[PDB]
Amino acid sequence: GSSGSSGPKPLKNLDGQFCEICGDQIGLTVEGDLFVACNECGFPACRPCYEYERREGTQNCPQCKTRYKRLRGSPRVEGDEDEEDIDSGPSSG
């Protein structure tokens, strides 16, 4: 049996920064700032979670599926940005 944190009033926690994909707590970037994979929607994805999505993934946020961007520890991939095309018709979302 447990509750969460010691003492009465809870301590800074369960904010959300904690990645959702795997769970691990989204640490800090190579510089120090908070590592926020996706900001547009706000999908909590650690470092080893964002890169992949672009490495082997599809390069589209699994929450909003928006255009990505070369991060600190994320080398460019084949599908970062494309040019306007005659492909219209939003099948899903």
Task: State the SS3 of 8-61.
Answer: CCCCCCCCCCECCCCCCECCECCCCCECCCCCCCCCCCCHHHHHHHHHCCCCEC
Which of these ranges, 6-14, 44-52, 71-79, 81-89, lies near Zn ion under the rule CB under 5 A? 44-52
* Nearest CA-CA partner of 23 in 4, 48, 6: 48
To Zn ion, the closest distance from the beta carbon of 31 in angstroms equals 19
61 binds Zn ion (CB under 5 A): yes
43 binds Zn ion (CB under 5 A): yes
**Residues at the interface with Zn ion (CB under 5 A):** 19, 21-22, 24, 38, 41, 43, 46, 49, 61, 63-64
Which residues participate in the annotated binding site for Zn(2+)?
19, 22, 38, 41, 46, 49, 61, 64
